[PDB]
């Protein structure tokens, strides 16, 4: 019997945050049923590194941090340790030797309609390359020079957010591949997510 925390519910919803307001859904004390997502799943690019996708239920980790994302298909491969590109460098980054799964599935349907969606922005042109797992929520006119402008854009002072300009008739690599980065956490705290 056991139970089932709403992993499969947060996985599917009309609206997954953005690339920078990416959700931080902690999970504990639940038998997260991964069989649905690996044993029998239609979820492309189910590339999980840190532990083999098979027999993943056998593994217990201390805090499952399901992530929510909408990123262009080309940038899907940018969700990896370091890699390159606007993802994982100016955005949610995954630390080296990170343990977890990356489930990226095409989402041309399910809330991806004509015209660049108001939500599902970029997050680029920040001061540094960011650190792994740190949320970047605050939005401020990004400084690209010495003079600090006083809150209105122009040249430099770039707005650090950019709308994903996709239509439901884009190519193959441009359709938003809704991806979740299931961030395992094997630390010195008691393991909570176990079970078949």
């Amino acid at each position: 019997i056991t139970n089932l925390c709403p992993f499969g519910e947060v996985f599917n919803a009309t609206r997954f945050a953005s690339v920078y307001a990416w959700n931080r859904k902690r999970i504990s004390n639940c038998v997260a049923d991964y069989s649905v997502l690996y044993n029998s799943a239609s979820f492309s690019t189910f590339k999980c590194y840190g532990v083999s996708p098979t027999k993943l239920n056998d593994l217990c980790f201390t805090n499952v941090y399901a992530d929510s994302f909408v990123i262009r298909g080309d940038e899907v491969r940018q969700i990896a340790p370091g890699q390159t590109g606007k993802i994982a460098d100016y955005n949610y980054k995954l630390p080296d030797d990170f343990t977890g799964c990356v489930i990226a599935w095409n989402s041309n349907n399910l809330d991806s309609k004509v015209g660049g969606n108001y939500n599902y922005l970029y997050r680029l042109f920040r001061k540094s390359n960011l650190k792994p797992f740190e949320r970047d929520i605050s939005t401020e006119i990004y400084q690209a020079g010495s003079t600090p402008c006083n809150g209105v854009e122009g040249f430099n002072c770039y707005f650090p957010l950019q709308s994903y300009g996709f239509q439901p008739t884009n190519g193959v690599g441009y359709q938003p591949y809704r991806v979740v980065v299931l961030s395992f956490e094997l630390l010195h705290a008691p393991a909570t997510v176990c079970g078949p």
Partner: antibody, heavy 123, light 108 residues
Framework: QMQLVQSGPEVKKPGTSVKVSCKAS????????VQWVRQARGQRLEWIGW????????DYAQQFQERVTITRDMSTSTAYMELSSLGSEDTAVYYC????????????????WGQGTMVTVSS | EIVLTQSPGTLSLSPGERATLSCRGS???????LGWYQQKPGQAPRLLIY???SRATGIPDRFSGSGSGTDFTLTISRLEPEDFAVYYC?????????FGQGTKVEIK
């Protein structure tokens, strides 16, 4: 010295489309915006349009409404510019500019300038 | 549509005496988002100054911006002969940016 090269001269039927290519190399052409100004023969230059490669923003002068589109290309690190229904008087060299700069937070001024792209609208 | 009237173009300046070029803002604009880049006679231009902050990159520091608000000046305490070129004061503050009035400077 950072190379900002562009396509050679183009001869185009007045009232048609043009595609001015400006490739930026030697520096990160992702954190740098791009700026286009037109210089004819003898009169000082003015906007064509300017874009931010990363920020997805594009502008242009009030005299170039719905007739200038400036498109980026990160894959080849180039800035493309299209003048639709360009007037017969648009015969001029079409420049491209950007800050010669590297890093997330990088230089402010417009150090590097393109070699220019002579554009002629001839019968 | 910002208009930057300047010191009259074709103003005579030669090495051995102080040279000065100036363009005045239509309305006093932020100084650090200006900049005067010169176009050589038959080449692309290159940045020299912006808000009087930096030096003249690739040029001896005789070049130097100055002024506040509308009236910005580039002083050349001892002019040099290679600078026969047309300067103009870039304006990259508010969205509209003005780039042409003909602030030519000749040498000898």
């Amino acid at each position: 010295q950072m190379q900002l090269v562009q396509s050679g001269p183009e001869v185009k039927k007045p009232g048609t489309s043009v595609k001015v290519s400006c490739k930026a190399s030697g520096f990160t052409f992702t954190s740098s915006a791009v700026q286009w100004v037109r210089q004819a023969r003898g009169q000082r230059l003015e906007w064509i349009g300017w874009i931010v490669v990363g920020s997805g923003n594009t502008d242009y002068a009030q005299q170039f409404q719905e007739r200038v589109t400036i498109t980026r290309d990160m894959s080849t690190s180039t800035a493309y510019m299209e003048l639709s229904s360009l007037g017969s008087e648009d015969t001029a060299v079409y420049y491209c500019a950007a800050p010669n700069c590297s890093g997330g937070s990088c230089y402010d001024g417009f150090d590097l300038w393109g070699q220019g792209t002579m554009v002629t609208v001839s019968s | 549509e910002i208009v930057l009237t300047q010191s009259p173009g074709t103003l005579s300046l030669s090495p051995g005496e102080r040279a000065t070029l100036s363009c005045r803002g239509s309305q006093s604009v932020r100084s650090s988002y200006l900049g005067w880049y010169q176009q050589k006679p038959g080449q692309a231009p290159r940045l020299l100054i912006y808000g009087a902050s930096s030096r003249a990159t690739g040029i001896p520091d005789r070049f130097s911006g100055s002024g506040s608000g509308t009236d910005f000046t580039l002083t050349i305490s001892r002019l040099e002969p290679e600078d026969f070129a047309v300067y103009y004061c870039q304006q990259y503050g508010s969205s509209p940016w003005t780039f042409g009035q003909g602030t030519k400077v000749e040498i000898k």
